[PDB]
Structures are given as structure tokens and as C-alpha cells.
Amino acid sequence: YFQSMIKFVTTEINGLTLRGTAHVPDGEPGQQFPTVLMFHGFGAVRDEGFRLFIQMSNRLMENGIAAVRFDFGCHGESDGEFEDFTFSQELNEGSALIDAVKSMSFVDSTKFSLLGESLGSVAASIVAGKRSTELTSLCMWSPAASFLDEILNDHTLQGKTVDNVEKDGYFDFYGLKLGKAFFDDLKNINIFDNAKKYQGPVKIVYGTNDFIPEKYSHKYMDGYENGELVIVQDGDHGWQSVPSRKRILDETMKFFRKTLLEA
Amino acid sequence: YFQSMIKFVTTEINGLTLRGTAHVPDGEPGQQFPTVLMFHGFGAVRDEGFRLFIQMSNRLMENGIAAVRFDFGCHGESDGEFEDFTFSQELNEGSALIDAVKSMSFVDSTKFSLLGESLGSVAASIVAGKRSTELTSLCMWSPAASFLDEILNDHTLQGKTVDNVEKDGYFDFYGLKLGKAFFDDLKNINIFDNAKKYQGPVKIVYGTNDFIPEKYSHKYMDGYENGELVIVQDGDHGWQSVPSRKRILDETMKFFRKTLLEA
């Protein structure tokens, strides 16, 4: 037998080392577990805000579900400069992470789901649609699916102008340099036509104080044949109150218990 | 001969596993390097905000200085619940981390310094005073040395009332539960008398947009025999603009080159 354990993992994807963390439940040698792979948000790290993904990871692990979470390229401790980041690269890494994590020794590749937060939810929704037979279920927190509309139609990124990127070479995001390549890549991105290709169980959790408009979650639901939308009164983008934190952890554990442990 | 590498490290302190990252310069097998240990801020993680400690670690590593950074107990990926967190535990851990890192194969026990950000700077100042003969130098960014005054005199923590802790059972910090034990323990904490015991080279970097009052940096200077205070015009608490991020990385590399490489 073996007690539960936290271990660090790395993988190489198109020339970048991505670094991550794995929460393995207790079990016998060689035992394989239903697994959730988690995608963090824009300019975030694999911990997520204020231990959010760590708390979710340990909750899953304490219930027999392995939890795996990597820093995307150009984020956190992975290789890559933010100035070179593109959302296309994030989607390509998300696809390659499915294959890398399904190959890990403790992962039951037949019981395998994605969890996202904010922009990570967007990536997860698109990856799920392109890899529509690979995922047992999909859970999306606070999907930041307005970012194309905001940048391309309103010419702002979280409220700050993008109109100087061409002249000045980059966008200043909290001290990080976001390059022109990111912006030139937005023309290649499609959210909802990709996302609606996934027909498995989907849960979306939206908080009424999220700065993303609620309409985007209803657009997702419009395309999902097997979706569920939970609206958390007074929940915010990052689940940054003790009551909304308890709610997001509980709602997500319930979904993955249903789709990974009881199906 | 080995190229530079990033690796993950753990240690056990008072029954908690603390988890961290080490950036090791390239060199010969078994080589021992001058080393900086970094302490993150309150409710933060070892990466720090927006890759701040990651960029600093890599800058040091590319110049022949090893960089090591752990999540404190009850923070990040380390063991422990935020509700059980106390600053006394952080101080004990910061002291114990000196020996955990100096035990590592790549670390020169005689060329070892601390770097802090915000509350981590306060922790580093106190640990430095108690273990003065262990440190070649000390660098403190944005020291949050007002927290005792703010909580004990003004009954707020970063502006939010602490007067409901007994009624609520906790203090809500961005969705984490901060417990009564933290507030009960504040009476045990002494910053400035402990800090002035360190007589090695100290550098403080303060940004004019920091929400921490500037007078706390001057108070530190009053007690240091070999201190230097750099005031970064338009710098902020987390160095979250591209100009101030460049500035903080350069000012810190200059200081550790002087104190760890050229001395």
C-alpha cells in the first residue's frame, strides 16, 4: 500500500519544458485513478489565486481522484517568455498535456476530465471540442470567453487599451510584457463553434459578481447537449470569499464524483 | 559538466512538508554556489506575483548565483491550513530554512543571503537578526512592516476590519480562512529590535506607489549600520509595471553581485 502523495512533474512540448504538480490518492502499487487535469487563467499560475487549485486538488485527492495541474508555457515556472505567448500555443499545449498526462503511471486514461478557471476554461472548452472523444467530463469556472470581443471590438484588455501595441511593441500586463504575436494570433481563435463539438457532461459555475458578462455562459449552454449551469449568488471571478470558496469546491467535487466515481 | 537546471525541493519543519524550487547555475559536478533564499509575502506563493520571484531566480541563476524559494507553511503547495497560520511559525520556518538550504549539495554555506518581498521582507529582517552570522547580505523589497501597527492600533488588515473575527470565527482573506491563532500570536512579534541585530550589508528597495507607508523603511534604516535605501520613483508594492520590474531585477542583481560575487 501507499499513502497519498504530492509530486512534481515535467513535460516537454514543442521546445518548452512545462512544469506541474500531481496529487495522487492513496492506493496500492501501480493503481490507476480517475484524473482531473486543471487549466489556470491568463497570466496566472498552476496554484491559481489564493490556493484555489491547491484546495481543489487536495479535495479530489482525498476522494480517490488524482489532480494534475501544469503552468502553461510562458506562465509560472514553465519555460517561455510572456512576450512570446499566444493563445494558439496555449491550446496546443492543452492538447499535448492531455496526451502527456494520460500516459502517466497513476492515470486511468478512460476516466479523465478537464477543469478550467477563467481563460483556462476557455482553453479547456476549445480543447474539449477538438478532442471530443478524449474527455469523460468538463467543468468550467468563470469562463473568460469575452476576451476576443473585448480586445477586437472594444480595443481593451481587462479595461486597458491595446491600441499602442503596434507602435510600442508590447502590452504591459502587471509588469509582464505581452507581445504583438499574442494580438496577431487572436484572428485564429474560435471559441463557440469549437466548444459545441463536445457532447459529454459539462458543468459551468458562474458567480453573479464576475466581471465577465453572464451572457457568455448562456452561449456555452446553448451549444452543449449535456450542460449544467450553476449560478452562485455573490460569487466572484476568483472565488475570493470564504462562502463562495466553499461553494465552488463543493459544487466541483459533486460533479466529478458523479462523472468519474459513480458513472 | 552540467548545464543550469530547475529542480523541486522539499523539507520537513515542525511536522509540515514545505515545498520549493531551486534554480542551479551551470557548473562542475558537486560545485557549491553562492545562494539567495527568497521569502514570499502574506498569503502569496513562492512564484510571487506575476512571475516576480521566477524572473529574479533566473536572473541570479544565469549569473552564477543559486536561487531557492519555498512556500511557507500554510501557503502555496506546502502543508498546513491558512486557519492555523501564525507569524511565529513563519519566523521559525524561515530560520529552519537556512539550514535546510545550506544542507543542499549545490549551496555554499559561507556565501548565503536572504531576499524578501513584502511580509517576507519582515520575516527576513527578523530571521537575519536572530541568525546574523549565517547571512552574507540581506535584501528587502517593499517591507510590509506596518502590519502590527495596522492590525493592533487601527484594527484593520489591508484596510478590512479585524473586529468581526470572534463573531465570524475567522478573518476572510480572499477566500482563505485566517484564524484566531494568527491574531493571538501578534503580541509575540518584535520587528525592529530583532532587525537591528543584523549588521551586515542590507539593501531596501521601496516604490513610491507602495501602499505601505515609507516611514517603515526609514525606521529600518535607523537601526542598520550598513544599510542602503533605494526609492524607486513610481515603483509599486509588487513591481507590477514593466519599468519597475526591470528596475527591481537590476537593482537586486547589482546588490547580490556586489555582496556574493565581488566580495
Ligand SMILES: COc1cc(/C=C/C(=O)O)ccc1O
Ligand atoms: C486576455 O484578455 C482578457 C482576459 C480576461 C480574463 C482572463 C483570466 O482571468 O484568465 C478577461 C478579458 C480579457 O480581454
Ligand SMILES: COc1cc(/C=C/C(=O)O)ccc1O
Ligand atoms: C522579460 O521579462 C521582463 C523584462 C524586463 C526588462 C527587460 C530589459 O532588460 O530590457 C521588464 C519586464 C519584464 O516582464
Ligand SMILES: COc1cc(/C=C/C(=O)O)ccc1O
Ligand atoms: C497581515 O497583515 C498585513 C499584511 C500586509 C502585506 C503583506 C504582504 O504584502 O506580504 C499589509 C498590512 C497588513 O496589516
Ligand SMILES: COc1cc(/C=C/C(=O)O)ccc1O
Ligand atoms: C480550508 O479553507 C477554506 C474552507 C472553506 C470551507 C470549507 C467547508 O466548510 O466545506 C472555505 C474557504 C476556505 O479557504
Ligand SMILES: [Ca+2]
Ligand atoms: Ca527537518
Ligand SMILES: [Ca+2]
Ligand atoms: Ca507531509
